[PDB]
Design a protein around this ligand. Structure first.
Ligand SMILES: OC[C@H]1O[C@H](O[C@H]2[C@H](O)[C@@H](O)[C@@H](O[C@H]3[C@H](O)[C@@H](O)[C@@H](O[C@H]4[C@H](O)[C@@H](O)[C@@H](O)O[C@@H]4CO)O[C@@H]3CO)O[C@@H]2CO)[C@H](O)[C@@H](O)[C@@H]1O
Ligand SMILES: OC[C@H]1O[C@H](O[C@H]2[C@H](O)[C@@H](O)[C@@H](O[C@H]3[C@H](O)[C@@H](O)[C@@H](O)O[C@@H]3CO)O[C@@H]2CO)[C@H](O)[C@@H](O)[C@@H]1O
Length: 209
């Protein structure tokens, strides 16, 4: 299942989430997984994880191995398909009012030129991003500066609504329909291939350098 934890740090700018159940440590050995500064939310840090929903887990927020940790709290994840938590004085599953759902999708363009488009449909009316309110081929998207051959598109919504999109070059090359499941306020996906050969990754693939 897709886990997301946001923490308004009270332990400094270097923090991690340690998760455990019966000696299972899905976020890694102590101190766990480092939480990255949350985009668009000063003071917050965020980590994502895939874990086995066969069980609940315990969470220990800490300063990433530098001697300080908060008291354990239970993540009642058993049987759930997804879960996003906010920790700001206490554990919450309620999105803060000012937060949006920001979905980032990376596409690896190979031998289809340097002008790439993203066509999008099915999102909430509040949606903003390259392809909103645009008929085929959609909106043109820029290249990822740090990753060669990749292009990025970001769709922001006020509500947690799934949608679909297609990457293309407006010249006969396009992906399969990409069905985007929004599982958190900072959902990230990686896409490769074209029609018949489109693959969607929920964690960065080896192709992501
Ligand atoms: O899952 C089965 C076990 O569950 C329980 O163990 C838990 C602990 O209760 C938690 O506290 C935690 O342990 C952490 C610990 O909190 C953390 O500080 C770190 O411990 C280091 C410590 O920093 C360092 O100073 C030195 O003392 O070594 C310690 C190593 O023990 O890391 C610990 C985890 O590796 O999580 C565990 C589960 O992983 C329960 O208490 C057990 O009885 C049970 O078997
Ligand atoms: O929601 C209504 C509509 O949704 C689906 O249609 C989508 C297509 O499945 C999808 O491929 C895409 O179509 C584009 C073509 O791929 C592209 O080649 C070019 O011709 O532009 C098309 C978009 O105008 O998007 C549409 C939705 O706009 C679903 O399959 C339909 O059954 C359904 O009617």
């Amino acid at each position: 299942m897709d886990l997301t934890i946001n923490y308004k740090s009270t332990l400094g700018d270097d923090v991690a989430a340690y998760i455990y159940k019966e000696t299972n440590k899905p976020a890694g050995e102590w101190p766990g997984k480092t939480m990255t500064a949350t985009a668009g939310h000063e003071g917050w840090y965020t980590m994502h994880l895939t874990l086995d929903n066969s069980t609940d887990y315990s969470l220990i927020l800490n300063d990433d191995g530098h001697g300080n940790q908060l008291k354990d709290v239970t993540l009642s994840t058993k049987g759930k398909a997804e879960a996003e938590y906010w920790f700001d004085g206490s554990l919450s599953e309620t999105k803060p009012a000012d937060w949006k759902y920001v979905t980032t999708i990376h596409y690896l363009a190979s031998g289809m030129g340097s002008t790439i488009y993203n066509y999008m449909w099915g999102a909430d009316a509040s949606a903003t991003g390259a392809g909103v309110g645009k008929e085929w081929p959609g909106g043109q998207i820029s290249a990822n500066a740090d990753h060669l051959g990749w292009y990025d598109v970001v769709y922001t919504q006020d509500v947690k609504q799934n949608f679909s999109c297609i990457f293309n070059n407006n010249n006969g090359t396009q992906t399969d329909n990409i069905d985007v499941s929004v599982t958190s306020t900072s959902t990230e996906l990686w896409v490769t291939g074209t029609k018949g050969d489109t693959t969607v990754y929920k964690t960065a693939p080896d192709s992501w350098e």
